[PDB]
């Protein structure tokens, strides 16, 4: 038996509210952040044109076994051949035409299927970044002629290609090609294809648009309940918490939301239909499955609301010895170096994060000086490939400073792990720093000037 979680909030913005996605997301945040996910129905005439050739769009399928609590990690189809497989799979599974299968029954059956080890149901799906073989479902600039209709949606805030690069995703001004975090993912679903419980890298927001097809079913948990959920999952599937050694080696799983609810974890659900958005909030766990053949597009983003959580996240990563996707401090300093061009509310928020950064950095440098690290030299950390500037102990990506030693050339530790670098006395160590404290205060003041005008 399956008891569906309560429905998440559904928002229907007027065109005035809808015009600015960041203003709207800030408006709904008090409500939506208590549920982790929410659904947004755009104004009825906001209809970006879904147009593609099913025979030239093609992708390499991923394959999925559907067993609850079993670990998962993070051939060629055209859209047409995948759709034909997907449709025959579902109609044969239920011996029904695909749109007479009620969504409630698919949900019930999904949770039955994944709990029964007697059934070896495997499905396939597409998940990849936009590429030349498979691009965004939103119109993008390309010197193809677009209809005026498509041109109307080229610059939309809700065109997910624009959202990262706008004024207000602080992830915009990052120079480091992240790929995973400024670029949309494309999701080609079939019945029962599912995404395991996860949060986004660096606790970012995410926004997901279902271009067309049968619904996508979601489960979401608010950010405040994140550790609650992890403790429940640790108890019931400890295999998923044995630290796997890479950023590509991370273990995730399917788990019945009723199990979370039994352990007093708040869980919300929704069916996302074609033309609707789902937004996930920072540190909001989510999972779900596709009801049938469909096509979705999603992107991470970071608002000013998120900045302190991004700092908290990197602290949390350092403690799990988890790899970072980027350096949060490097992003902050990059924005400070562009203070004159920043949005003024962005500038004010970055300035507050930078004040914490500088005070933390001052204390860390005083601690390591008391350990006998005397020598120091400036170092342009941002020039180093990420794998050359990770702390040996905690894998954090260094930027503000690190400790090196002549005894272990090329190795670095962050300033929390001075004692973990090598066995040589401390006077052989060297503090490598991006900025002196005297460099840092004028950068923060530029932000204040930009903000106060």
Ligand X SMILES: C=CC(=O)N1CCC(n2cc(C3=Nc4c(C#N)cnn4C(=O)C3C(C)C)cn2)CC1
Binding site for Mn ion (CB under 5 A): 67, 119
Record the tokens describing residue 145, joined without a space. 């002629």
Is the Cα dihedral 276, 279, 284, 286 positive or negative? positive
Tell me which residues in 5-44 interact with ligand X (CB under 6 A): none
Interaction pattern, residues 247-286, with ligand X; x per rule: CB under 6 A: ---------------------------------------x
Q: Is 127 in the site for ligand X (CB under 6 A)?
A: yes
Q: Which is nearer to Mn ion, 67 or 72 (CB)?
A: 67
Q: Which is nearer to ligand X, 243 or 406 (CB)?
A: 243
Number of residues that bind Zn ion (CB under 5 A): 6
SS3 category, 63: strand
Q: Is 150 annotated as a binding residue?
A: no
Interaction pattern, residues 371-410, with Zn ion; x per rule: CB under 5 A: --------------------x-xx----------------
Residues 91, 101: Cα–Cα separation, whole Å: 9
Q: Point out which span in 185-193, 225-233, 255-263, 307-315 binds ligand X (CB under 6 A).
A: 185-193
Q: Is 125 annotated as a binding residue?
A: yes
Residue recorded with tokens 């149901």: 121
The listed partner (ligand X, Mn ion, Zn ion, none) that binds 35, CB under 5 to 8 Å by sort, is none
Centre a 10 Å sphere on the Cβ of residue 311 and count the other Cβ atoms it contains.
Answer: 19
DSSP-assigned letters across all residues of 37-105: EEEE---TT--------TTT-EEPPEEEE--TT--EE---EEHHHHHHHHHHHHHHHHTS-GGGS-HHH
Residues 314, 320: Cα–Cα separation, whole Å: 10
Q: Is 187 in the site for ligand X (CB under 6 A)?
A: yes
Is the Cα dihedral 289, 62, 123, 78 positive or negative? positive
Residue sitting closest to ligand X (CB): 195
Task: Count the helix, strand and coil residues of the chain and give each as a percent rounded to the nearest 5.
Answer: 35, 20, 45
The listed partner (Zn ion, Mn ion, ligand X, none) that binds 127, CB under 5 to 8 Å by sort, is ligand X
The phi, psi pair for 129, rounded to 5°, reads -70, 155
Q: Is 447 in the site for Zn ion (CB under 5 A)?
A: no
Q: Is 216 annotated as a binding residue?
A: yes
Residue 394 CB contacts under 8 Å (≥ 6 apart), including other chains: 317, 318, 319, 321, 414, 416, 417
Q: Looking at 264-367, which runs of residues are DSSP E strands?
A: 268-272, 277-280, 286-290, 294-301
Q: Which is nearer to ligand X, 243 or 262 (CB)?
A: 243
Q: Which is nearer to ligand X, 135 or 426 (CB)?
A: 135
* Shortest distance (Å) from residue 242 CB to ligand X: 19
Residue recorded with tokens 């606790």: 203
Number of residues that bind ligand X (CB under 6 A): 14
Q: Which is nearer to ligand X, 158 or 435 (CB)?
A: 158
Residues 395, 400: Cα–Cα separation, whole Å: 15
* Shortest distance (Å) from residue 59 CB to ligand X: 11
Distance from chain centroid for Cα 33? 16
Known binding residues for Fe cation are: 198, 200, 286
Q: Where along the sequence are the contacts to ligand X (CB under 6 A)?
A: 74, 125, 127, 187, 189, 193-195, 208, 216, 286, 290, 296, 298
Known binding residues are: 125, 198, 200, 206, 208, 216, 286
Q: Where along the sequence are the contacts to Zn ion (CB under 5 A)?
A: 391, 393-394, 414, 416-417
């Amino acid at each position: 038996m399956f008891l569906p979680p309560p429905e998440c909030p559904v928002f229907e913005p007027s065109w005035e509210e809808f015009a600015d996605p960041f203003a709207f997301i800030h408006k709904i945040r008090p409500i939506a952040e208590q549920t982790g996910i929410c659904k947004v129905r755009p104004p009825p005439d906001w209809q970006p044109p879904f147009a593609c050739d099913v025979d030239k769009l093609h992708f390499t399928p991923r394959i999925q076994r559907l067993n609850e609590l079993e670990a998962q990690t993070r051939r060629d189809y055209t859209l047409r051949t995948f759709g034909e497989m997907a449709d025959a799979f579902k109609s044969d599974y239920f011996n029904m035409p695909v749109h007479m299968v009620p969504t409630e029954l698919v949900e019930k059956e999904f949770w039955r299927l994944v709990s029964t080890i007697e059934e070896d149901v495997t499905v396939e799906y597409g998940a990849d970044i936009a590429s030349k073989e498979f691009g965004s479902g939103f119109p993008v600039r390309d010197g193809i002629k677009l209809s005026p209709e498509e041109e109307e949606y080229l610059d939309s805030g809700w065109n997910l290609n624009n959202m990262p690069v706008m004024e207000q995703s602080v992830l915009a001004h990052i120079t480091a090609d992240i790929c995973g975090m400024k670029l949309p993912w494309l999701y080609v679903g079939m019945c029962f294809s599912s995404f395991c419980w996860h949060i986004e890298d660096h606790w970012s927001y995410s926004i997901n648009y279902l271009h067309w097809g049968e619904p996508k079913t979601w489960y979401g948990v608010p950010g405040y309940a994140a550790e609650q959920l992890e403790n429940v999952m640790k108890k019931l599937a400890p295999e998923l918490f044995v630290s796997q050694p890479d950023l590509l080696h991370q273990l995730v799983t399917i788990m019945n939301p009723n199990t979370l609810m039994t352990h007093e974890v708040p869980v919300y659900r929704t069916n996302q239909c074609a033309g609707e958005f789902v937004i996930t909030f920072p540190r909001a766990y989510h999972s779900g499955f596709n009801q049938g053949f469909n096509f979705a597009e999603a992107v991470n983003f970071c608002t000013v609301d998120w900045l302190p959580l991004g700092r908290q996240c990197v602290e949390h990563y350092r403690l799990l010895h988890r790899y970072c996707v980027f350096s949060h401090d490097e992003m902050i300093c990059k924005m400070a170096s562009k203070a004159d061009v920043l949005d003024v509310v962005v500038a004010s928020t970055v300035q507050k994060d930078m004040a914490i950064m500088i005070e933390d950095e001052k204390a860390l440098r005083e601690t390591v000086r008391k350990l006998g690290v005397i020598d120091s030299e400036r170092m342009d950390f941002e020039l180093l490939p990420d794998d050359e500037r990770q702390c040996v102990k905690c894998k954090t990506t260094c930027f503000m400073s690190a400790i090196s030693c002549s005894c272990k050339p090329g190795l670095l530790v962050c300033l929390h792990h001075v004692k973990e670098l090598c066995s040589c006395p401390p006077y052989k160590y060297k503090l490598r720093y991006r900025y002196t404290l005297d460099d840092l205060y004028p950068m923060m003041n530029a932000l204040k000037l930009r903000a106060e005008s």
